[PDB]
């Protein structure tokens, strides 16, 4: 049906039902988060606050996942065991990481109920990303005492970051248990993040998939790829801004410097991906808490294996946390080559031309000659175009399916990115 007949029913078929479902899904999680935020302001003993958030986490998990929340609860218990047995050693990170690895593998063998296991990962993952975190923050000395059972449980089951919420370090949660005054910036941040989450949801559901035929007079295999990539990006940004809102509602996600308290828990920066500078900025700004967790607790450890062999292990860990699907695993493996080759090639180009063409906008104290020349703008724009093209290629797998689906979807595109990356690596090794 034509554009007019589409827009005549757009609002009644897309704008109201999508937002209705988006609000019906979270009207209870937001209520529980607000109840926790208000309850943690009565000057209660800390153990009672941790017990309250444990109860809230149980109730929230039960409300989302009917009774399969055991596959999370169990994990939590298991984690604490591996934290209490090796509490004295300096291997806490390694033991907790091996436990998480064994648990996720034993889960991905598709023995236990998979219809609901494959939809709890978004929560289960977080728990893992928390436990391992502590296991290393105690080793390097960034956390003093091994927490008591109630503190650890109230950390894993933090009602703000249990369902969608991002990973937050143990100290960034302890400083939330103390609680901060209900300022106006707090409500402002919560409302802004909720509005942006709803906007990204309604913009991903059916303004994305119907982008180029109707919203554009253009219309193929590349246009569908780009619209699928945009739909996927915004379907993520929904969860991102919603997690940011639920974590700023429960009290967490705030920095303080020179008695200045600011709520700036950023999870996803959409303007660094839709108008990208480089694929490194796309990856590290697709999910900021996870992009910091992986760089700090996986890459920095496996760095002994060599730079590339550590980047690849980091992407393997990221493809294991998200849940192993062949399209997602292929994307998160190709991203390793793409990002590494682009980074090192831009590095060589900047060292040769003495220009500011690094994969990140340099600091003001760089030793480059061409800081703002038109050639620098042209190179940055060409690499941004390559980044948009890599995104439109990779995100084509997430339309709305094992090796056959991926091979077919990438054969319709004639393997454009996997040849552009090879060409860029050849170009890098030739001008070496």
């Amino acid at each position: 049906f034509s554009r007019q007949e589409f827009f005549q029913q757009l609002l009644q078929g897309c704008l109201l039902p999508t937002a209705q479902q988006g609000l019906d899904q979270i009207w209870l999680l937001l209520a529980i988060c607000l109840a926790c935020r208000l309850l943690w302001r009565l000057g209660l003993p800390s153990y009672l606050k941790h017990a309250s958030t444990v109860a809230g986490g149980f109730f929230s998990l039960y409300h989302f996942f009917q009774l399969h929340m055991v596959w999370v609860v169990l994990l939590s218990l298991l984690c604490y065991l591996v934290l209490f047995l090796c509490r004295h050693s300096s291997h806490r990170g390694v033991f907790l990481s091996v436990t998480i690895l064994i648990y996720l593998l034993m889960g991905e063998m598709h023995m236990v109920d998979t219809v609901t296991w494959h939809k709890m990962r978004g929560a289960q993952m977080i728990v893992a990303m928390k436990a391992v975190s502590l296991g290393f923050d105690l080793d390097r000395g960034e956390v003093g005492t091994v927490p008591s059972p109630v503190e650890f449980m109230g950390y894993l089951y933090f009602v703000g970051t249990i369902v969608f919420g991002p990973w937050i370090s143990f100290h960034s949660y302890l400083q939330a248990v103390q609680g901060r005054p209900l300022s106006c910036r707090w409500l402002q941040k919560v409302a802004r993040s909720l509005a942006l989450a709803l906007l990204c949801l309604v913009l991903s559901t059916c303004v994305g998939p119907y982008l180029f035929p109707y919203f554009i007079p253009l219309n193929a295999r590349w246009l569908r790829a780009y619209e699928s990539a945009v739909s996927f990006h915004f379907s993520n940004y929904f969860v991102g801004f919603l997690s940011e809102a639920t974590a700023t509602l429960a009290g967490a996600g705030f920095t303080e410097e020179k008695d200045h308290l600011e709520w700036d828990l950023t999870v996803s920066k959409p303007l660094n991906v839709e108008l990208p500078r480089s694929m490194v900025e796309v990856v590290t700004s697709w999910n900021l808490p996870m992009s910091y967790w992986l760089n700090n607790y996986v890459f920095k450890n496996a760095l002994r294996l060599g730079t590339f062999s550590a980047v690849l292990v980091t992407y393997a860990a990221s493809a294991l946390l998200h849940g192993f699907s062949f399209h997602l695993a292929a994307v998160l493996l190709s991203l390793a080559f793409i990002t590494y080759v682009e980074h090192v090639l831009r590095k060589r180009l900047a060292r040769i031309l003495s220009a500011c063409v690094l994969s990140k906008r340099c600091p003001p104290d760089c030793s480059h000659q061409h800081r703002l020349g038109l050639g620098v703008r042209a190179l940055n724009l060409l690499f941004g175009a390559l980044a948009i093209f890599h995104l439109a290629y990779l995100g084509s797998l997430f339309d709305v399916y094992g090796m056959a689906y991926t091979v077919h979807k990438w054969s319709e595109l004639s393997w454009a990115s996997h040849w552009v990356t090879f060409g860029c690596w050849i170009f890098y090794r030739l001008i070496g």
Partner: antibody
Amino acid sequence: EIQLQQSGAELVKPGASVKMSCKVSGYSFTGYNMNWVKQSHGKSLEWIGNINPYYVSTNYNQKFTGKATFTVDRSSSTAYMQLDSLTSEDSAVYYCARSYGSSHTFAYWGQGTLVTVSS
Amino acid sequence: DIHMTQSPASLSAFVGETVTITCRTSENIFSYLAWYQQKQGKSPQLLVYNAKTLTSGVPSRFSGSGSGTQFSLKINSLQPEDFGSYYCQHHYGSPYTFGGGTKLEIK
């Protein structure tokens, strides 16, 4: 019995570098963190930093970064700290201390080396 | 950085009295705080950790208590070998900072 033997006193010219040594004996060296602490004369203690002997990642105090570097020797179970560009403000006693394990309190202390900077 | 103040800077009592040293923390540490004792010319020794738990081999007269931003060590029935500097040191997270140091002296 746990014993953290330490090097002898040092007298260094201003601007030079010094390298201490804390030899551990009494437990598995790669089991617990090793903190380095500085105490002036008649003053309070200051936490220079720590090193994890299992994986050699370190953790410095921001006031002592770039001035003290930590290294380890697992074969002889010895933790070294190197102070660079010493001034007259670094004449103090330096202790090594094994973390308690569960908590990060300094359970077993060394004996300290007196580092004096003069001409 | 967490600023730890400690009071009093220097006190003096007879043998067999009861003394209370206080440590006030700028930020809020939940219960993470240790008390070390250092005699004249020796390395410190861990006396109390978690602000109440006594270490292995310490007499039962050292009784530390408190929580939040106000902790206190209580030395009752003072003994001759209990004279020296006492440092409070939080262990809530790097970087750990020590207190000023109360110097218990003879009287």
